Amino acid sequence: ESQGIERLHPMQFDHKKELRKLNMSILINFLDLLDILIRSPGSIKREEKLEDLKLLFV
Amino acid sequence: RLSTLIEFLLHRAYSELMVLTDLLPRKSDVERKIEIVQFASRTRQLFVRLLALVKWANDAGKVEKCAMISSFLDQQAILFVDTADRLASLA
Amino acid sequence: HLEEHLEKFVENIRQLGIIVSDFQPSSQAGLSQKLNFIVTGLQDIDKCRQQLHDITVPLEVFEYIDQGRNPQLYTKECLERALAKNEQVKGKIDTMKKFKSLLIQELSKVFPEDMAKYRSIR
């Protein structure tokens, strides 16, 4: 998690820590989707956040 | 665009005037009736075209505004559908 | 406002010539042809004036013109589409709000760190 991609998950790799990281990523993705739908679709941070969350889960 | 129809109408009017003015001494009653029916049809078509032109000129800027609004709504709907499909495929 | 008055006068003259020539016209019926040519020229001038702005004329405009009706039906359809789009946007916003509320509840019931972050840090 600390090499190859952005470092988000710590060295603990706990089940609760992974669940909290996934929840934070889902909240960020929801905020980005709401901002894109409300203001303008010129924001593509939602797909990047989803890919980062998928990589962290993997 | 408009040039094609303008030229067609000009050619039709020229042919009609040449047929009605040069050979006027060789026209029958049925020919006169057919010419009157053609003139009435042309007048109805011209009235419809004038009504359409008036409806387009009285709402020329409004037509552009409505087209822009419809395009923006369609783009927003397409972006929403694409985002939903991407989320469904990722989840 | 001289083009519309002239167009109306030409239309009235053409109607009067058609109503007067309902009998057997032996003379040269040039008045009807002149009125039709004047009306066509006025329509062409109005079309050129409307196209001088160089707007993006789509294929639907020509189709609705050839259909034989006015653009008022298209305006009503666009208004209905705008109302439906507003309703769909409201429904999507309500669904997003419900999803956000459910996510916040799941966070509060799972990990209070993310809830505290979203409530005070953000």
PDB file of all heavy atoms in Angstrom, chain C residues 5-61, unseen atoms left out:
ATOM      1  N   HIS C   5     -46.010  44.915 -42.433  1.00  0.00           N
ATOM      2  CA  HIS C   5     -47.149  45.600 -43.036  1.00  0.00           C
ATOM      3  C   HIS C   5     -47.208  45.345 -44.537  1.00  0.00           C
ATOM      4  O   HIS C   5     -48.284  45.099 -45.093  1.00  0.00           O
ATOM      5  CB  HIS C   5     -47.074  47.100 -42.744  1.00  0.00           C
ATOM      6  N   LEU C   6     -46.055  45.392 -45.209  1.00  0.00           N
ATOM      7  CA  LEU C   6     -46.024  45.109 -46.640  1.00  0.00           C
ATOM      8  C   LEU C   6     -46.401  43.663 -46.932  1.00  0.00           C
ATOM      9  O   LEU C   6     -47.101  43.392 -47.915  1.00  0.00           O
ATOM     10  CB  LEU C   6     -44.640  45.424 -47.208  1.00  0.00           C
ATOM     11  N   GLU C   7     -45.961  42.727 -46.091  1.00  0.00           N
ATOM     12  CA  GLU C   7     -46.320  41.325 -46.282  1.00  0.00           C
ATOM     13  C   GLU C   7     -47.820  41.119 -46.103  1.00  0.00           C
ATOM     14  O   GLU C   7     -48.461  40.395 -46.874  1.00  0.00           O
ATOM     15  CB  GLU C   7     -45.530  40.446 -45.311  1.00  0.00           C
ATOM     16  N   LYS C   8     -48.400  41.756 -45.081  1.00  0.00           N
ATOM     17  CA  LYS C   8     -49.842  41.666 -44.875  1.00  0.00           C
ATOM     18  C   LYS C   8     -50.612  42.289 -46.033  1.00  0.00           C
ATOM     19  O   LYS C   8     -51.641  41.748 -46.452  1.00  0.00           O
ATOM     20  CB  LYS C   8     -50.228  42.338 -43.558  1.00  0.00           C
ATOM     21  N   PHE C   9     -50.129  43.413 -46.564  1.00  0.00           N
ATOM     22  CA  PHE C   9     -50.789  44.038 -47.705  1.00  0.00           C
ATOM     23  C   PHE C   9     -50.716  43.142 -48.936  1.00  0.00           C
ATOM     24  O   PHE C   9     -51.691  43.016 -49.686  1.00  0.00           O
ATOM     25  CB  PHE C   9     -50.163  45.403 -47.991  1.00  0.00           C
ATOM     26  N   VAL C  10     -49.563  42.505 -49.157  1.00  0.00           N
ATOM     27  CA  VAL C  10     -49.417  41.604 -50.297  1.00  0.00           C
ATOM     28  C   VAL C  10     -50.336  40.399 -50.144  1.00  0.00           C
ATOM     29  O   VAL C  10     -50.947  39.937 -51.115  1.00  0.00           O
ATOM     30  CB  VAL C  10     -47.946  41.180 -50.460  1.00  0.00           C
ATOM     31  N   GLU C  11     -50.454  39.874 -48.921  1.00  0.00           N
ATOM     32  CA  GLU C  11     -51.348  38.744 -48.686  1.00  0.00           C
ATOM     33  C   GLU C  11     -52.803  39.134 -48.913  1.00  0.00           C
ATOM     34  O   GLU C  11     -53.570  38.373 -49.517  1.00  0.00           O
ATOM     35  CB  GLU C  11     -51.150  38.205 -47.269  1.00  0.00           C
ATOM     36  N   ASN C  12     -53.202  40.317 -48.439  1.00  0.00           N
ATOM     37  CA  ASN C  12     -54.568  40.782 -48.656  1.00  0.00           C
ATOM     38  C   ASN C  12     -54.845  40.991 -50.140  1.00  0.00           C
ATOM     39  O   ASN C  12     -55.932  40.667 -50.632  1.00  0.00           O
ATOM     40  CB  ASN C  12     -54.813  42.072 -47.871  1.00  0.00           C
ATOM     41  N   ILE C  13     -53.864  41.525 -50.872  1.00  0.00           N
ATOM     42  CA  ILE C  13     -54.041  41.736 -52.305  1.00  0.00           C
ATOM     43  C   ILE C  13     -54.150  40.406 -53.038  1.00  0.00           C
ATOM     44  O   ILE C  13     -54.959  40.265 -53.963  1.00  0.00           O
ATOM     45  CB  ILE C  13     -52.892  42.594 -52.865  1.00  0.00           C
ATOM     46  N   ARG C  14     -53.353  39.411 -52.641  1.00  0.00           N
ATOM     47  CA  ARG C  14     -53.450  38.096 -53.266  1.00  0.00           C
ATOM     48  C   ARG C  14     -54.795  37.444 -52.970  1.00  0.00           C
ATOM     49  O   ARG C  14     -55.400  36.827 -53.854  1.00  0.00           O
ATOM     50  CB  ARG C  14     -52.304  37.204 -52.791  1.00  0.00           C
ATOM     51  N   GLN C  15     -55.283  37.578 -51.733  1.00  0.00           N
ATOM     52  CA  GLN C  15     -56.593  37.032 -51.395  1.00  0.00           C
ATOM     53  C   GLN C  15     -57.699  37.716 -52.190  1.00  0.00           C
ATOM     54  O   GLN C  15     -58.625  37.056 -52.677  1.00  0.00           O
ATOM     55  CB  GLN C  15     -56.847  37.168 -49.894  1.00  0.00           C
ATOM     56  N   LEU C  16     -57.614  39.041 -52.340  1.00  0.00           N
ATOM     57  CA  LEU C  16     -58.618  39.764 -53.114  1.00  0.00           C
ATOM     58  C   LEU C  16     -58.570  39.369 -54.585  1.00  0.00           C
ATOM     59  O   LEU C  16     -59.614  39.238 -55.233  1.00  0.00           O
ATOM     60  CB  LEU C  16     -58.417  41.271 -52.955  1.00  0.00           C
ATOM     61  N   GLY C  17     -57.368  39.175 -55.128  1.00  0.00           N
ATOM     62  CA  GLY C  17     -57.256  38.745 -56.512  1.00  0.00           C
ATOM     63  C   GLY C  17     -57.772  37.336 -56.727  1.00  0.00           C
ATOM     64  O   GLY C  17     -58.346  37.030 -57.776  1.00  0.00           O
ATOM     65  N   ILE C  18     -57.576  36.458 -55.741  1.00  0.00           N
ATOM     66  CA  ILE C  18     -58.088  35.097 -55.852  1.00  0.00           C
ATOM     67  C   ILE C  18     -59.607  35.087 -55.738  1.00  0.00           C
ATOM     68  O   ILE C  18     -60.290  34.310 -56.417  1.00  0.00           O
ATOM     69  CB  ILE C  18     -57.433  34.191 -54.794  1.00  0.00           C
ATOM     70  N   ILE C  19     -60.163  35.947 -54.880  1.00  0.00           N
ATOM     71  CA  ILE C  19     -61.610  36.013 -54.729  1.00  0.00           C
ATOM     72  C   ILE C  19     -62.274  36.686 -55.922  1.00  0.00           C
ATOM     73  O   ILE C  19     -63.427  36.375 -56.241  1.00  0.00           O
ATOM     74  CB  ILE C  19     -61.983  36.741 -53.425  1.00  0.00           C
ATOM     75  N   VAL C  20     -61.579  37.603 -56.590  1.00  0.00           N
ATOM     76  CA  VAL C  20     -62.146  38.291 -57.747  1.00  0.00           C
ATOM     77  C   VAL C  20     -62.000  37.461 -59.014  1.00  0.00           C
ATOM     78  O   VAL C  20     -62.839  37.540 -59.915  1.00  0.00           O
ATOM     79  CB  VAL C  20     -61.492  39.679 -57.906  1.00  0.00           C
ATOM     80  N   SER C  21     -60.941  36.656 -59.107  1.00  0.00           N
ATOM     81  CA  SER C  21     -60.706  35.796 -60.259  1.00  0.00           C
ATOM     82  C   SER C  21     -61.356  34.427 -60.105  1.00  0.00           C
ATOM     83  O   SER C  21     -60.935  33.470 -60.765  1.00  0.00           O
ATOM     84  CB  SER C  21     -59.204  35.643 -60.507  1.00  0.00           C
ATOM     85  N   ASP C  22     -62.370  34.311 -59.248  1.00  0.00           N
ATOM     86  CA  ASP C  22     -63.077  33.049 -59.072  1.00  0.00           C
ATOM     87  C   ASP C  22     -63.916  32.734 -60.302  1.00  0.00           C
ATOM     88  O   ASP C  22     -64.269  31.575 -60.545  1.00  0.00           O
ATOM     89  CB  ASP C  22     -63.956  33.095 -57.820  1.00  0.00           C
ATOM     90  N   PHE C  23     -64.241  33.763 -61.085  1.00  0.00           N
ATOM     91  CA  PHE C  23     -64.959  33.579 -62.339  1.00  0.00           C
ATOM     92  C   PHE C  23     -63.984  33.225 -63.454  1.00  0.00           C
ATOM     93  O   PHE C  23     -62.812  32.933 -63.192  1.00  0.00           O
ATOM     94  CB  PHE C  23     -65.751  34.839 -62.697  1.00  0.00           C
ATOM     95  N   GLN C  24     -64.452  33.249 -64.699  1.00  0.00           N
ATOM     96  CA  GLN C  24     -63.590  32.934 -65.830  1.00  0.00           C
ATOM     97  C   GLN C  24     -62.762  34.158 -66.204  1.00  0.00           C
ATOM     98  O   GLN C  24     -63.258  35.061 -66.889  1.00  0.00           O
ATOM     99  CB  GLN C  24     -64.417  32.460 -67.025  1.00  0.00           C
ATOM    100  N   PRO C  25     -61.499  34.225 -65.776  1.00  0.00           N
ATOM    101  CA  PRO C  25     -60.676  35.396 -66.104  1.00  0.00           C
ATOM    102  C   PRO C  25     -60.094  35.324 -67.505  1.00  0.00           C
ATOM    103  O   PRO C  25     -59.217  34.498 -67.781  1.00  0.00           O
ATOM    104  CB  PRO C  25     -59.576  35.361 -65.035  1.00  0.00           C
ATOM    105  N   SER C  26     -60.574  36.188 -68.401  1.00  0.00           N
ATOM    106  CA  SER C  26     -60.054  36.210 -69.764  1.00  0.00           C
ATOM    107  C   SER C  26     -58.814  37.090 -69.876  1.00  0.00           C
ATOM    108  O   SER C  26     -57.954  36.848 -70.730  1.00  0.00           O
ATOM    109  CB  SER C  26     -61.137  36.687 -70.732  1.00  0.00           C
ATOM    110  N   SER C  27     -58.707  38.108 -69.028  1.00  0.00           N
ATOM    111  CA  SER C  27     -57.569  39.013 -69.068  1.00  0.00           C
ATOM    112  C   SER C  27     -56.338  38.346 -68.456  1.00  0.00           C
ATOM    113  O   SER C  27     -56.391  37.229 -67.932  1.00  0.00           O
ATOM    114  CB  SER C  27     -57.902  40.316 -68.345  1.00  0.00           C
ATOM    115  N   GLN C  28     -55.210  39.048 -68.526  1.00  0.00           N
ATOM    116  CA  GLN C  28     -53.959  38.530 -67.986  1.00  0.00           C
ATOM    117  C   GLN C  28     -53.974  38.615 -66.465  1.00  0.00           C
ATOM    118  O   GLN C  28     -54.061  39.708 -65.896  1.00  0.00           O
ATOM    119  CB  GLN C  28     -52.776  39.307 -68.558  1.00  0.00           C
ATOM    120  N   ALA C  29     -53.888  37.459 -65.805  1.00  0.00           N
ATOM    121  CA  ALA C  29     -53.896  37.389 -64.344  1.00  0.00           C
ATOM    122  C   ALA C  29     -52.466  37.550 -63.834  1.00  0.00           C
ATOM    123  O   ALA C  29     -51.831  36.615 -63.341  1.00  0.00           O
ATOM    124  CB  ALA C  29     -54.515  36.080 -63.872  1.00  0.00           C
ATOM    125  N   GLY C  30     -51.949  38.775 -63.960  1.00  0.00           N
ATOM    126  CA  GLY C  30     -50.605  39.066 -63.496  1.00  0.00           C
ATOM    127  C   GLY C  30     -50.535  39.531 -62.056  1.00  0.00           C
ATOM    128  O   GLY C  30     -49.464  39.450 -61.442  1.00  0.00           O
ATOM    129  N   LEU C  31     -51.650  40.015 -61.504  1.00  0.00           N
ATOM    130  CA  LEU C  31     -51.654  40.507 -60.131  1.00  0.00           C
ATOM    131  C   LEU C  31     -51.379  39.390 -59.130  1.00  0.00           C
ATOM    132  O   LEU C  31     -50.624  39.588 -58.171  1.00  0.00           O
ATOM    133  CB  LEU C  31     -52.990  41.182 -59.819  1.00  0.00           C
ATOM    134  N   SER C  32     -51.977  38.215 -59.337  1.00  0.00           N
ATOM    135  CA  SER C  32     -51.743  37.097 -58.429  1.00  0.00           C
ATOM    136  C   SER C  32     -50.290  36.642 -58.476  1.00  0.00           C
ATOM    137  O   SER C  32     -49.683  36.373 -57.431  1.00  0.00           O
ATOM    138  CB  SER C  32     -52.680  35.939 -58.769  1.00  0.00           C
ATOM    139  N   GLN C  33     -49.712  36.555 -59.677  1.00  0.00           N
ATOM    140  CA  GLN C  33     -48.310  36.175 -59.797  1.00  0.00           C
ATOM    141  C   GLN C  33     -47.391  37.210 -59.164  1.00  0.00           C
ATOM    142  O   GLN C  33     -46.413  36.844 -58.500  1.00  0.00           O
ATOM    143  CB  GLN C  33     -47.944  35.970 -61.268  1.00  0.00           C
ATOM    144  N   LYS C  34     -47.688  38.499 -59.346  1.00  0.00           N
ATOM    145  CA  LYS C  34     -46.875  39.540 -58.726  1.00  0.00           C
ATOM    146  C   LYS C  34     -46.965  39.477 -57.206  1.00  0.00           C
ATOM    147  O   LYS C  34     -45.953  39.630 -56.512  1.00  0.00           O
ATOM    148  CB  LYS C  34     -47.303  40.915 -59.235  1.00  0.00           C
ATOM    149  N   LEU C  35     -48.167  39.244 -56.672  1.00  0.00           N
ATOM    150  CA  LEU C  35     -48.323  39.133 -55.225  1.00  0.00           C
ATOM    151  C   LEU C  35     -47.581  37.918 -54.683  1.00  0.00           C
ATOM    152  O   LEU C  35     -46.942  37.992 -53.626  1.00  0.00           O
ATOM    153  CB  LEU C  35     -49.806  39.065 -54.860  1.00  0.00           C
ATOM    154  N   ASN C  36     -47.649  36.791 -55.396  1.00  0.00           N
ATOM    155  CA  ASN C  36     -46.928  35.598 -54.961  1.00  0.00           C
ATOM    156  C   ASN C  36     -45.421  35.823 -54.991  1.00  0.00           C
ATOM    157  O   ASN C  36     -44.707  35.402 -54.074  1.00  0.00           O
ATOM    158  CB  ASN C  36     -47.312  34.404 -55.835  1.00  0.00           C
ATOM    159  N   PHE C  37     -44.920  36.492 -56.033  1.00  0.00           N
ATOM    160  CA  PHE C  37     -43.492  36.782 -56.107  1.00  0.00           C
ATOM    161  C   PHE C  37     -43.063  37.727 -54.992  1.00  0.00           C
ATOM    162  O   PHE C  37     -41.988  37.558 -54.405  1.00  0.00           O
ATOM    163  CB  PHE C  37     -43.146  37.369 -57.475  1.00  0.00           C
ATOM    164  N   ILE C  38     -43.894  38.724 -54.680  1.00  0.00           N
ATOM    165  CA  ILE C  38     -43.566  39.660 -53.606  1.00  0.00           C
ATOM    166  C   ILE C  38     -43.546  38.940 -52.264  1.00  0.00           C
ATOM    167  O   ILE C  38     -42.676  39.184 -51.419  1.00  0.00           O
ATOM    168  CB  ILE C  38     -44.554  40.839 -53.601  1.00  0.00           C
ATOM    169  N   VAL C  39     -44.504  38.035 -52.048  1.00  0.00           N
ATOM    170  CA  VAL C  39     -44.547  37.284 -50.797  1.00  0.00           C
ATOM    171  C   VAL C  39     -43.336  36.367 -50.682  1.00  0.00           C
ATOM    172  O   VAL C  39     -42.740  36.236 -49.606  1.00  0.00           O
ATOM    173  CB  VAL C  39     -45.865  36.497 -50.692  1.00  0.00           C
ATOM    174  N   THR C  40     -42.947  35.725 -51.787  1.00  0.00           N
ATOM    175  CA  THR C  40     -41.766  34.869 -51.766  1.00  0.00           C
ATOM    176  C   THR C  40     -40.504  35.676 -51.490  1.00  0.00           C
ATOM    177  O   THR C  40     -39.633  35.236 -50.730  1.00  0.00           O
ATOM    178  CB  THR C  40     -41.639  34.113 -53.089  1.00  0.00           C
ATOM    179  N   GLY C  41     -40.390  36.863 -52.091  1.00  0.00           N
ATOM    180  CA  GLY C  41     -39.238  37.706 -51.824  1.00  0.00           C
ATOM    181  C   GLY C  41     -39.184  38.182 -50.385  1.00  0.00           C
ATOM    182  O   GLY C  41     -38.113  38.228 -49.776  1.00  0.00           O
ATOM    183  N   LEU C  42     -40.342  38.531 -49.818  1.00  0.00           N
ATOM    184  CA  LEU C  42     -40.382  38.942 -48.418  1.00  0.00           C
ATOM    185  C   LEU C  42     -40.004  37.789 -47.496  1.00  0.00           C
ATOM    186  O   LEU C  42     -39.274  37.982 -46.516  1.00  0.00           O
ATOM    187  CB  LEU C  42     -41.770  39.480 -48.067  1.00  0.00           C
ATOM    188  N   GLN C  43     -40.488  36.582 -47.797  1.00  0.00           N
ATOM    189  CA  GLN C  43     -40.127  35.421 -46.989  1.00  0.00           C
ATOM    190  C   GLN C  43     -38.637  35.122 -47.092  1.00  0.00           C
ATOM    191  O   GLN C  43     -37.994  34.782 -46.090  1.00  0.00           O
ATOM    192  CB  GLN C  43     -40.951  34.207 -47.417  1.00  0.00           C
ATOM    193  N   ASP C  44     -38.067  35.253 -48.292  1.00  0.00           N
ATOM    194  CA  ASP C  44     -36.635  35.030 -48.458  1.00  0.00           C
ATOM    195  C   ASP C  44     -35.821  36.077 -47.708  1.00  0.00           C
ATOM    196  O   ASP C  44     -34.792  35.756 -47.104  1.00  0.00           O
ATOM    197  CB  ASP C  44     -36.272  35.031 -49.943  1.00  0.00           C
ATOM    198  N   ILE C  45     -36.271  37.335 -47.728  1.00  0.00           N
ATOM    199  CA  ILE C  45     -35.574  38.385 -46.991  1.00  0.00           C
ATOM    200  C   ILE C  45     -35.645  38.130 -45.493  1.00  0.00           C
ATOM    201  O   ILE C  45     -34.654  38.317 -44.777  1.00  0.00           O
ATOM    202  CB  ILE C  45     -36.151  39.768 -47.356  1.00  0.00           C
ATOM    203  N   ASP C  46     -36.805  37.696 -44.995  1.00  0.00           N
ATOM    204  CA  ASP C  46     -36.927  37.384 -43.574  1.00  0.00           C
ATOM    205  C   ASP C  46     -36.044  36.202 -43.191  1.00  0.00           C
ATOM    206  O   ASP C  46     -35.420  36.206 -42.122  1.00  0.00           O
ATOM    207  CB  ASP C  46     -38.387  37.102 -43.221  1.00  0.00           C
ATOM    208  N   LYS C  47     -35.972  35.185 -44.054  1.00  0.00           N
ATOM    209  CA  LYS C  47     -35.110  34.040 -43.778  1.00  0.00           C
ATOM    210  C   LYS C  47     -33.642  34.446 -43.769  1.00  0.00           C
ATOM    211  O   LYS C  47     -32.868  33.988 -42.921  1.00  0.00           O
ATOM    212  CB  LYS C  47     -35.356  32.937 -44.807  1.00  0.00           C
ATOM    213  N   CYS C  48     -33.240  35.314 -44.701  1.00  0.00           N
ATOM    214  CA  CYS C  48     -31.860  35.791 -44.720  1.00  0.00           C
ATOM    215  C   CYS C  48     -31.548  36.622 -43.483  1.00  0.00           C
ATOM    216  O   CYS C  48     -30.448  36.530 -42.925  1.00  0.00           O
ATOM    217  CB  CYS C  48     -31.603  36.600 -45.993  1.00  0.00           C
ATOM    218  N   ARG C  49     -32.504  37.439 -43.037  1.00  0.00           N
ATOM    219  CA  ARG C  49     -32.301  38.229 -41.827  1.00  0.00           C
ATOM    220  C   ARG C  49     -32.164  37.330 -40.605  1.00  0.00           C
ATOM    221  O   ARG C  49     -31.321  37.575 -39.733  1.00  0.00           O
ATOM    222  CB  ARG C  49     -33.454  39.218 -41.646  1.00  0.00           C
ATOM    223  N   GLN C  50     -32.987  36.283 -40.522  1.00  0.00           N
ATOM    224  CA  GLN C  50     -32.893  35.350 -39.406  1.00  0.00           C
ATOM    225  C   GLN C  50     -31.624  34.508 -39.458  1.00  0.00           C
ATOM    226  O   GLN C  50     -31.122  34.102 -38.405  1.00  0.00           O
ATOM    227  CB  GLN C  50     -34.121  34.438 -39.377  1.00  0.00           C
ATOM    228  N   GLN C  51     -31.098  34.238 -40.653  1.00  0.00           N
ATOM    229  CA  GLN C  51     -29.877  33.455 -40.793  1.00  0.00           C
ATOM    230  C   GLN C  51     -28.617  34.304 -40.718  1.00  0.00           C
ATOM    231  O   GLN C  51     -27.512  33.751 -40.650  1.00  0.00           O
ATOM    232  CB  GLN C  51     -29.894  32.683 -42.115  1.00  0.00           C
ATOM    233  N   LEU C  52     -28.756  35.633 -40.744  1.00  0.00           N
ATOM    234  CA  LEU C  52     -27.588  36.503 -40.632  1.00  0.00           C
ATOM    235  C   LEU C  52     -26.853  36.281 -39.316  1.00  0.00           C
ATOM    236  O   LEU C  52     -25.635  36.478 -39.236  1.00  0.00           O
ATOM    237  CB  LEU C  52     -28.012  37.966 -40.771  1.00  0.00           C
ATOM    238  N   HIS C  53     -27.577  35.871 -38.271  1.00  0.00           N
ATOM    239  CA  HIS C  53     -26.939  35.576 -36.993  1.00  0.00           C
ATOM    240  C   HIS C  53     -26.075  34.323 -37.054  1.00  0.00           C
ATOM    241  O   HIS C  53     -25.268  34.098 -36.145  1.00  0.00           O
ATOM    242  CB  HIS C  53     -27.999  35.423 -35.900  1.00  0.00           C
ATOM    243  N   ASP C  54     -26.231  33.506 -38.100  1.00  0.00           N
ATOM    244  CA  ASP C  54     -25.450  32.288 -38.293  1.00  0.00           C
ATOM    245  C   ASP C  54     -25.605  31.335 -37.114  1.00  0.00           C
ATOM    246  O   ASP C  54     -24.612  30.922 -36.508  1.00  0.00           O
ATOM    247  CB  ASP C  54     -23.972  32.624 -38.518  1.00  0.00           C
ATOM    248  N   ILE C  55     -26.843  30.982 -36.786  1.00  0.00           N
ATOM    249  CA  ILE C  55     -27.114  30.061 -35.693  1.00  0.00           C
ATOM    250  C   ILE C  55     -26.937  28.631 -36.187  1.00  0.00           C
ATOM    251  O   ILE C  55     -26.971  28.349 -37.387  1.00  0.00           O
ATOM    252  CB  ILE C  55     -28.523  30.277 -35.107  1.00  0.00           C
ATOM    253  N   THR C  56     -26.746  27.712 -35.239  1.00  0.00           N
ATOM    254  CA  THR C  56     -26.578  26.293 -35.553  1.00  0.00           C
ATOM    255  C   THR C  56     -27.948  25.703 -35.870  1.00  0.00           C
ATOM    256  O   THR C  56     -28.654  25.168 -35.011  1.00  0.00           O
ATOM    257  CB  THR C  56     -25.903  25.561 -34.399  1.00  0.00           C
ATOM    258  N   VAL C  57     -28.327  25.805 -37.141  1.00  0.00           N
ATOM    259  CA  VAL C  57     -29.622  25.316 -37.608  1.00  0.00           C
ATOM    260  C   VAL C  57     -29.589  23.794 -37.666  1.00  0.00           C
ATOM    261  O   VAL C  57     -28.924  23.222 -38.542  1.00  0.00           O
ATOM    262  CB  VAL C  57     -29.984  25.914 -38.976  1.00  0.00           C
ATOM    263  N   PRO C  58     -30.280  23.103 -36.767  1.00  0.00           N
ATOM    264  CA  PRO C  58     -30.281  21.640 -36.783  1.00  0.00           C
ATOM    265  C   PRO C  58     -31.267  21.091 -37.809  1.00  0.00           C
ATOM    266  O   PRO C  58     -32.056  21.820 -38.413  1.00  0.00           O
ATOM    267  CB  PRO C  58     -30.716  21.277 -35.356  1.00  0.00           C
ATOM    268  N   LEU C  59     -31.202  19.771 -37.997  1.00  0.00           N
ATOM    269  CA  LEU C  59     -32.086  19.097 -38.939  1.00  0.00           C
ATOM    270  C   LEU C  59     -33.530  19.047 -38.458  1.00  0.00           C
ATOM    271  O   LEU C  59     -34.433  18.856 -39.280  1.00  0.00           O
ATOM    272  CB  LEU C  59     -31.585  17.676 -39.208  1.00  0.00           C
ATOM    273  N   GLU C  60     -33.768  19.211 -37.155  1.00  0.00           N
ATOM    274  CA  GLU C  60     -35.131  19.184 -36.640  1.00  0.00           C
ATOM    275  C   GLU C  60     -35.936  20.401 -37.071  1.00  0.00           C
ATOM    276  O   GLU C  60     -37.163  20.308 -37.188  1.00  0.00           O
ATOM    277  CB  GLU C  60     -35.113  19.084 -35.113  1.00  0.00           C
ATOM    278  N   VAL C  61     -35.278  21.538 -37.314  1.00  0.00           N
ATOM    279  CA  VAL C  61     -35.989  22.742 -37.739  1.00  0.00           C
ATOM    280  C   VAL C  61     -36.606  22.532 -39.117  1.00  0.00           C
ATOM    281  O   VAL C  61     -37.790  22.810 -39.341  1.00  0.00           O
ATOM    282  CB  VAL C  61     -35.048  23.959 -37.722  1.00  0.00           C
TER     283      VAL C  61
END
